[PDB]
Design an enzyme around this catalytic site. Structure first.
Site, PDB file in Angstrom:
ATOM      1  N   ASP A 152       0.807  -1.216   0.000  1.00 50.33           N
ATOM      2  CA  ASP A 152       0.000   0.000   0.000  1.00 50.33           C
ATOM      3  C   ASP A 152       0.850   1.281   0.000  1.00 50.33           C
ATOM      4  O   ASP A 152       0.363   2.340   0.358  1.00 50.33           O
ATOM      5  CB  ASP A 152      -1.092  -0.042   1.083  1.00 50.33           C
ATOM      6  CG  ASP A 152      -2.291   0.866   0.794  1.00 50.33           C
ATOM      7  OD1 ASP A 152      -2.455   1.300  -0.383  1.00 50.33           O
ATOM      8  OD2 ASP A 152      -3.057   1.166   1.740  1.00 50.33           O
ATOM      9  N   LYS A 154       2.449   4.713  -0.924  1.00 52.68           N
ATOM     10  CA  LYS A 154       2.063   5.887  -1.694  1.00 52.68           C
ATOM     11  C   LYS A 154       2.270   7.125  -0.808  1.00 52.68           C
ATOM     12  O   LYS A 154       2.212   7.034   0.412  1.00 52.68           O
ATOM     13  CB  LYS A 154       0.617   5.712  -2.167  1.00 52.68           C
ATOM     14  CG  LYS A 154      -0.431   6.188  -1.184  1.00 52.68           C
ATOM     15  CD  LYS A 154      -1.837   5.964  -1.662  1.00 52.68           C
ATOM     16  CE  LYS A 154      -2.481   4.734  -1.043  1.00 52.68           C
ATOM     17  NZ  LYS A 154      -3.586   5.089  -0.120  1.00 52.68           N
ATOM     18  N   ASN A 157       0.273   7.938   2.576  1.00 50.99           N
ATOM     19  CA  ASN A 157       0.297   7.038   3.717  1.00 50.99           C
ATOM     20  C   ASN A 157       1.557   7.222   4.560  1.00 50.99           C
ATOM     21  O   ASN A 157       1.813   6.406   5.443  1.00 50.99           O
ATOM     22  CB  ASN A 157       0.284   5.575   3.268  1.00 50.99           C
ATOM     23  CG  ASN A 157      -1.058   5.140   2.731  1.00 50.99           C
ATOM     24  OD1 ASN A 157      -2.012   5.915   2.747  1.00 50.99           O
ATOM     25  ND2 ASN A 157      -1.138   3.908   2.254  1.00 50.99           N
ATOM     26  N   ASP A 170      -1.720   2.866   7.739  1.00 49.54           N
ATOM     27  CA  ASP A 170      -2.489   2.067   6.798  1.00 49.54           C
ATOM     28  C   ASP A 170      -1.852   0.692   6.665  1.00 49.54           C
ATOM     29  O   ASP A 170      -0.829   0.540   6.005  1.00 49.54           O
ATOM     30  CB  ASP A 170      -2.631   2.750   5.437  1.00 49.54           C
ATOM     31  CG  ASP A 170      -3.780   3.741   5.406  1.00 49.54           C
ATOM     32  OD1 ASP A 170      -3.752   4.680   6.216  1.00 49.54           O
ATOM     33  OD2 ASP A 170      -4.703   3.550   4.587  1.00 49.54           O
ATOM     34  N   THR A 187      -3.532   1.589  -4.838  1.00 52.82           N
ATOM     35  CA  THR A 187      -3.721   2.584  -5.880  1.00 52.82           C
ATOM     36  C   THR A 187      -3.118   2.072  -7.195  1.00 52.82           C
ATOM     37  O   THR A 187      -2.022   1.501  -7.245  1.00 52.82           O
ATOM     38  CB  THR A 187      -3.207   3.966  -5.438  1.00 52.82           C
ATOM     39  OG1 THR A 187      -3.834   4.941  -6.276  1.00 52.82           O
ATOM     40  CG2 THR A 187      -1.710   4.124  -5.574  1.00 52.82           C
TER      41      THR A 187
HETATM   42  C1  LIG Z   1      -5.620  11.736   8.882  1.00 49.12           C
HETATM   43  O1  LIG Z   1      -5.389  10.331   9.026  1.00 49.12           O
HETATM   44  C2  LIG Z   1      -4.549   9.801   9.983  1.00 49.12           C
HETATM   45  C3  LIG Z   1      -3.829  10.649  10.866  1.00 49.12           C
HETATM   46  C4  LIG Z   1      -2.981  10.074  11.812  1.00 49.12           C
HETATM   47  C5  LIG Z   1      -2.206  10.858  12.665  1.00 49.12           C
HETATM   48 CL1  LIG Z   1      -2.307  12.562  12.536  1.00 49.12          CL
HETATM   49  N1  LIG Z   1      -1.382  10.376  13.582  1.00 49.12           N
HETATM   50  C6  LIG Z   1      -1.267   9.048  13.678  1.00 49.12           C
HETATM   51  C7  LIG Z   1      -1.979   8.180  12.870  1.00 49.12           C
HETATM   52  C8  LIG Z   1      -2.836   8.702  11.917  1.00 49.12           C
HETATM   53  C9  LIG Z   1      -3.544   7.854  11.081  1.00 49.12           C
HETATM   54  C10 LIG Z   1      -4.410   8.385  10.131  1.00 49.12           C
HETATM   55  C11 LIG Z   1      -5.032   7.309   9.306  1.00 49.12           C
HETATM   56  O2  LIG Z   1      -5.070   6.149   9.745  1.00 49.12           O
HETATM   57  N2  LIG Z   1      -5.418   7.627   8.075  1.00 49.12           N
HETATM   58  C12 LIG Z   1      -5.958   6.654   7.153  1.00 49.12           C
HETATM   59  C13 LIG Z   1      -7.444   6.481   7.173  1.00 49.12           C
HETATM   60  C14 LIG Z   1      -7.954   5.257   6.726  1.00 49.12           C
HETATM   61  C15 LIG Z   1      -9.339   5.055   6.659  1.00 49.12           C
HETATM   62  C16 LIG Z   1     -10.198   6.080   7.046  1.00 49.12           C
HETATM   63  C17 LIG Z   1     -11.627   5.816   6.977  1.00 49.12           C
HETATM   64  N3  LIG Z   1     -12.779   5.675   6.928  1.00 49.12           N
HETATM   65  C18 LIG Z   1      -9.665   7.326   7.461  1.00 49.12           C
HETATM   66 CL2  LIG Z   1     -10.648   8.665   7.942  1.00 49.12          CL
HETATM   67  C19 LIG Z   1      -8.286   7.535   7.517  1.00 49.12           C
HETATM   68  C20 LIG Z   1      -5.606   7.036   5.676  1.00 49.12           C
HETATM   69  C21 LIG Z   1      -6.027   8.450   5.213  1.00 49.12           C
HETATM   70  C22 LIG Z   1      -5.077   8.696   4.040  1.00 49.12           C
HETATM   71  O3  LIG Z   1      -5.553   8.087   2.848  1.00 49.12           O
HETATM   72  C23 LIG Z   1      -3.787   7.996   4.431  1.00 49.12           C
HETATM   73  N4  LIG Z   1      -4.161   6.955   5.383  1.00 49.12           N
END
Ligand SMILES: COc1cc2c(Cl)nccc2cc1C(=O)N[C@@H](c1ccc(C#N)c(Cl)c1)[C@H]1C[C@H](O)CN1
Length: 336
Positions: A152, A154, A157, A170, A187
């Site tokens: 995954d 990219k 992430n 992720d 992707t």
């Molecule tokens: C804004 O997203 C994050 C912020 C984090 C911060 Cl600030 N600190 C620690 C861990 C974090 C994990 C994520 C996360 O898991 N995001 C994932 C994520 C996965 C699934 C969902 C759903 N539904 C969401 Cl909201 C975020 C995705 C978002 C992007 O595409 C990249 N990964």
């Protein structure tokens, strides 16, 4: 050296076999602000009422998870994240569930996603790109030693932490696999040829994806792009790259060996394994142990104006966190 990678594996397998469960609950946290949203959930910055510490809390709606057939992915992410331990992997502190939602609380990583920095300032220089790649190289070495395939990678992430280092999030698509596997996830722009050609693949896909990532960081856009996703596939199984003229000779050499369409000749997948990558001339000025221990000054440090600050993430309309009076989908999330 490898007395390291043996205890790392024993530790991984113990945690993997008996996952931590129910290590906190909602009312222990104050919800401050939305950091991101998705098809089945959102991510919120929260404060631990007692310790005053900031965290990122992923809130997944159990019903939407079922609707979109993400049961297995969701379970898998939590199981992997509570089992691994490496400097460049995000840390899961707590997880729990309620009538409505699943919860993952991770150490808050304040610099935001590499994707937005790359798009803010345009291509990174080679030294800047190399600093990032080195971290991904070591991270893949680690995950591969556990027989996990990342599949995954990219820009979006990779979060940047306060010291400018990468944290990978992720792990929904990550799979424990010795041998081959078939699922088509990831992707389109990052997929290796063997994934598309549907005769099975293995961990060698991560090294291909590393090639795409280094290309995108250094160029400002990915090597294989098009409007039609069918049309992207053809570009990939062909494998013809146009290298910008500003790319150094060493970089082109490394990418020819990572963006190798035949997995059996691709760097990271040969007898010397990851060392073929570490010993490449492009990485000549890299000190692998210093990177590992974080004793290298980062080429970029994010604007970091105080502990509860979220200005490296975008702004979202806030909505209420609703907990039903009645348990939903207990059977499907019992192992979470
Ligand atoms: C804004 O997203 C994050 C912020 C984090 C911060 Cl600030 N600190 C620690 C861990 C974090 C994990 C994520 C996360 O898991 N995001 C994932 C994520 C996965 C699934 C969902 C759903 N539904 C969401 Cl909201 C975020 C995705 C978002 C992007 O595409 C990249 N990964």
């Amino acid at each position: 050296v490898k007395e390291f990678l043996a205890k790392a594996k024993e530790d991984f397998l113990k945690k993997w076999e008996s996952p931590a469960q129910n290590t906190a609950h909602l009312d222990q946290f104050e919800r401050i602000k939305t950091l991101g949203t998705g098809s089945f959930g959102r991510v919120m910055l929260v404060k631990h009422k007692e310790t005053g510490n900031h965290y990122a809390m992923k809130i997944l709606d159990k019903q939407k998870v079922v609707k979109l057939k993400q049961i297995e992915h969701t379970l898998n992410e939590k199981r992997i994240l509570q089992a691994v331990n490496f400097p460049f992997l995000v840390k899961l502190e707590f997880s729990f569930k309620d009538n409505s939602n699943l919860y993952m609380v991770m150490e808050y990583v304040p610099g935001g996603e590499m994707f937005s920095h790359l798009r803010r300032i345009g291509r990174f220089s080679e030294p800047h790109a190399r600093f990032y790649a080195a971290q991904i190289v070591l991270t893949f070495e680690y995950l591969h030693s556990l027989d996990l395939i990342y599949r995954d990678l990219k820009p979006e992430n990779l979060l940047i932490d306060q010291q400018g280092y990468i944290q990978v999030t992720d792990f929904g698509f990550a799979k424990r696999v010795k041998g081959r596997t078939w699922t088509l996830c990831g992707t389109p722009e990052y997929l290796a040829p063997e994934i598309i050609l549907s005769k099975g693949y293995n961990k060698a896909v991560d090294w291909w994806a590393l090639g795409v990532l280094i290309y995108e960081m250094a160029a400002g856009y990915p090597p294989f792009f098009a409007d039609q996703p069918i049309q992207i596939y053809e570009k990939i199984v062909s494998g013809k790259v146009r290298f910008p003229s500003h790319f150094s000779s060493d970089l082109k050499d490394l990418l020819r060996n990572l963006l190798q369409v035949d997995l059996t000749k691709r760097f990271g997948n040969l007898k010397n394994g990851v060392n073929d990558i570490k010993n490449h001339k492009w990485f000549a000025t890299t000190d692998w142990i210093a990177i590992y221990q974080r004793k290298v000054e980062a080429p970029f440090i994010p604007k970091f104006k105080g502990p509860g600050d979220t200005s490296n993430f975008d702004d979202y309309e806030e909505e209420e966190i609703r907990v039903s009076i009645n348990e939903k989908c207990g059977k499907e999330f019992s192992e979470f």
